[PDB]
Nucleic acid binder design. Structure first.
Length: 101
RNA sequence: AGCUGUAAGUAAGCUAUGAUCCAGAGAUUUCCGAAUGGGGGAACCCAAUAUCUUUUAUAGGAUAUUACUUUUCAGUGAAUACAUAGCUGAUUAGAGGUAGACGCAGAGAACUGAAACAUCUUAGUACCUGCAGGAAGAGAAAGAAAAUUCGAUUCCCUGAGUAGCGGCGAGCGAAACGGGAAGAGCCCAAACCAACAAGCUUGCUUGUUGGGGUUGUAGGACUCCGAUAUGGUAGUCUGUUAGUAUAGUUGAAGGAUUUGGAAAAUUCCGCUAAAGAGGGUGAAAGCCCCGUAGACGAAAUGCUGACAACACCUAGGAGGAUCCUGAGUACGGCGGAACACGAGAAAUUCCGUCGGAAUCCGCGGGGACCAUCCCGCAAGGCUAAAUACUCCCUAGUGACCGAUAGUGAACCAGUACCGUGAGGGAAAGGUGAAAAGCACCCCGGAAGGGGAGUGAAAUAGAUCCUGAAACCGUGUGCCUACAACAAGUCAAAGCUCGUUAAUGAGUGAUGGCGUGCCUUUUGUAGAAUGAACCGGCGAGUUACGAUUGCAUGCGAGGUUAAGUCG
RNA sequence: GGUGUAGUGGUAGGAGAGCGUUCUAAGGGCGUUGAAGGUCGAUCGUGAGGACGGCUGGAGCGCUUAGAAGUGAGAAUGCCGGUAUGAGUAGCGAAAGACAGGUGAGAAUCCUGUCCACCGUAUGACUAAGGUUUCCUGGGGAAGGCUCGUCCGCCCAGGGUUAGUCGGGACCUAAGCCGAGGCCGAUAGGCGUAGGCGAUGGACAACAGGUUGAUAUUCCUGUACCAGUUGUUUGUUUGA
RNA sequence: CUUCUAGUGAGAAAACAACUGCCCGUACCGUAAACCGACACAGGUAGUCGAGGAGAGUAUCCUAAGGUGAGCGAGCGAACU
RNA sequence: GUGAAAUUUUAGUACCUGUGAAGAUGCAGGUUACCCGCGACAGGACGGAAAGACCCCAUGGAGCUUUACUGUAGUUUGAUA
């Protein structure tokens, strides 16, 4: 999906613009992604098997995948991603000076 | 790099030793149904014969085989002796469905038009039945014509609403010449000659296989010599490659600022294009995501070319003694039909019935019939393309619809529902960017509500976008219990307000005048006709011809049709 | 442009010139600092009609010039939908109940009792069609029930039907039906022989009692019967 | 079912014991609120059983075994039907 | 307690004598009459329900008759195979 489940990522659009975080889960075929600490939401649960005291709880919500950008692990600036011919495990070979991501 | 459909919810698991997913080839495939071992009220019931299994044994389980017809071969076989009916067995093919389409045949209406109706029209249309094919049908002159000819069939333009047909009425309605798309030709019978069998006429009569031979400028046989080579195919599940359909790969270029919950919007300053087609993203993006222009790719299976093999087919010149060239056929009388042609002066082509030729010194046609001239050679077979149609699969397109529209059906629709049955047949789309879908408290059995919270917004709370009218309520400024009112209009005191600012707005005691709307009628308030009310839908259009007015281009001239490239 | 003079009721019907709706092209524009749509106003033009302002609303839409049309609604005893009036009106589908006590948020209507009343060749018991889960147990009360409801043939969750001998098949045939060959006939097909299907009839071996919340000639107890199978108890000529 | 022969055709009669015996239906309503009548509808629905007194009787009235009080009520006690 | 229907242009819906498509709640001139209901009766609303079944028309249908026209199945008689 051009973004994987273990991955550091920066946010382009939507109220968390400029935040970073490690990807938490990938949902292909709906093209969304959960990022750590990024789209916090407040629910209201009644007691059930998990947390028999259901308070007002807060977890992340999935954002759309094109609101996101990969970060080169070694250098730290967000990059568009391209594919090139290494010994034939084709990996995302970063733009912005041809390094492996 | 995630995954176990819709589909939430939980429980158990799988995957970097490559899941899930995608394309080619395989394997498995209960029962009904042509249904085919026998039966039957479809999805059930009951067997026979062999091999194998459970049991000490019977009962029980499994696997194969077993319809009918045809067409080939053996065995058995008889009223009736020889053998043919028959019977048993082995072999060969059919059988049913559909694409509510397109084709060729058999049989074959009516309402309707003729301002009635019989001939005629509707119309050889609708319906029913047979046979197909990927196309069918037609197709290689017993032809079209009229001097000077041309050469198989089909389709389009034109000829032309002409020549004709017709209770000569309503109406029906050609063809050839001329211009184009596509183009292609072939095989038998007969005479004769051999091999075999029967009649052994031991005459050569019957036949079976092979050869020869295919036409009108007449051709062949037959006798004479030449040659014994050369031109082609509408052929094969044979090889060699080339492409192609069915998965995929890669693919340029942006940040800050203002307003917002959120920018793709605004303002600055950049970059990219063989890519500014389109879709998505919290609002409107060439530069965020999927793509696009361009470049690349197939283990397997199927298609289409090309070139190779293999299979088939194809010769001249002369002679004119004799033989061959499709018989109950052509044709004629009688009765019907088909030809645009309704018996007509009726040629041509078919069907039923009866009669019935000739043989190259011949036979047919040129719209009754004859003579002369001209063009052909029936009574045997096959054949690509140019033309018709779309159940279905891929890729797209639209001065086509947008939930009473568009399919009957945007949603679990040929469904619910209705009918014994054949058959008839609907209604019903939209929270939000994201479920963040209201934890906790209070009234109440609950339903429902009020706070508090989510959220940019809840009067976006699931009967959830917007939220019109009929219709039902609550509150108020002004009027109303001596008054006969198609309900308004003109005149007007009092009270209450204060506008798109101008000769202001609401209500109104009291006074004059005044019999709705539509349709059809000589004529309507009509006791003539229609409407409960509100909302939606609901009626002179298009194709091809003919005529007139206006307008433009050419002008004694004007203009192209089918078709070809695009 | 001025000025004079003359004219300007109208059904059938002829002629002219315009208003508004949707879509296409080209040009110039607007929009989350809020488009279309909805609602209100005391505004403009000779008419169809055009603006501007408030409130609502949340994503698209005007203007100019030309083009194309499923282009305008008050009426068809029109079609579909929604809602009125008649009106809190007719009716609530033959019949005897009363009281005490239970349950419950709530009782004329549900439960338990007592007395009273109704049918009794049926309004009692069993069965073939037909229906198809309506049967039993535990919960429920939004709709169905002509009132009510704590109740139910309603709704949710679980559960119930046991055969050598009963009724049907592995037995028989009636009417009628089907029919290998056959005979007839534009097609399709019509009839019919051998042989079959087809009960409402023929044939054919088990009874009495007990037991569940729901089955009993089916389960259990006792005592039987029918058809087979295994074991231990003479010449297929035929007198076996 | 019972006889008689024709008939491929070792030798089966009957004692005890113990074994074998398949498929379909089977709940519940059924003179009814469960079937046919659009309805929890004063209609229709084959067959067997169907008691007592008085009576010829399955008539008639009252009852036995069994079943039932019928799915809108409380008042008033006019016209009229 | 529950809860319909046929109907309906809008209605603040009197009487007499006239007028008028010639029999008026609504038009003229008069006469009478405070506002809103309940139980009853049927004179009027040419009352509701059914685009007259009576009568005539459409160069409308359909069923029937016959010495109306034109045909035909069936029966019969001749020629010919």
């Amino acid at each position: 999906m051009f973004v994987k489940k273990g991955d550091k990522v920066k946010v382009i659009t939507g109220k968390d613009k400029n935040k970073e975080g490690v990807v938490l889960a990938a949902f292909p075929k709906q093209d969304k992604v959960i990022v750590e600490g990024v789209n916090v939401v407040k629910k209201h649960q009644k007691p059930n098997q998990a947390a028999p005291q259901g308070g007002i709880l807060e977890v992340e919500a999935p954002i759309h995948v094109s609101n996101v950008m990969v970060i080169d692990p070694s250098n730290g600036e967000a990059t568009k991603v391209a594919f090139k011919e290494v010994d034939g495990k084709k990996v995302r070979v970063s733009k912005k000076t041809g390094e492996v991501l």
